[PDB]
Amino acid sequence: GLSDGEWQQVLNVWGKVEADIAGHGQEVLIRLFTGHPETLEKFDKFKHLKTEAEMKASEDLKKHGTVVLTALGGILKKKGHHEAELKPLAQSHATKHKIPIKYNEFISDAIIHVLHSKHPGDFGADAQGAMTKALELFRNDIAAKYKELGFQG
Numbered sequence: 091g092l093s094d095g096e097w098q099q100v101l102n103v104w105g106k107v108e109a110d111i112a113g114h115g116q117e118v119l120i121r122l123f124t125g126h127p128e129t130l131e132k133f134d135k136f137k138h139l140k141t142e143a144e145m146k147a148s149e150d151l152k153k154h155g156t157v158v159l160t161a162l163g164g165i166l167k168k169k170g171h172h173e174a175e176l177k178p179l180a181q182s183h184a185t186k187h188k189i190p191i192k193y194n195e196f197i198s199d200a201i202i203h204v205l206h207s208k209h210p211g212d213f214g215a216d217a218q219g220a221m222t223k224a225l226e227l228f229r230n231d232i233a234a235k236y237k238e239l240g241f242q243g
């Protein structure tokens with residue numbers, strides 16, 4: 091999937107996200123919600139936010155941010171050996187939350203954006219390459235599980 095050199099890059103970048111999981115989590119979800127308003131409708135607890143200020147002022151949104159990035163970090167530290175960690179995720183987003191694979195695409199892009207925004211100039215081309223490949227692997231493995239379930243939509 092990835093070489094050990096590329097995994098090394100991913101984990102180096104992840105070190106930036108661990109220094110402020112809540113600020114990073116928050117900005118990823120705001121970037122998603124503002125850029126793709128339909129994603130907001132999948133969250134009954136956040137569908138009430140209409141402005142970004144409101145979003146920025148929501149402590150519950152920062153909390154969910156932490157939950158998401160904690161789960162992602164766990165998976166990335168497995169360097170592709172994440173079947174155990176991913177099956178459950180895949181299963182709940184397909185059967186319970188009914189999240190199209192496309193939104194995983196969106197959040198993937200929103201991570202890259204936020205890293206460039208918070209770390210201008212020290213999110214290099216090699217680092218971007220490794221991070222993108224890692225997210226792709228994650229997305230691909232999810233998609234495999236969605237297929238088994240026939241979560242067509």
Ligand code: HEM
Pocket residue numbers: 129130132133134135157158159161162178179182183187189193194197
């Ligand atoms: C980077 C990928 C993602 C990660 C690691 C992630 C992680 C999580 C985790 C750990 C939970 C709580 C446990 C569970 O319900 O399985 C959760 C809940 C949820 N996720 Fe995700 N998620 C991701 C992507 C998304 C996307 C793209 C959407 C929607 C556009 C989404 C929608 C939801 C919803 C609606 C819930 C339930 C929230 C609640 O009411 O508490 N997830 N997610």
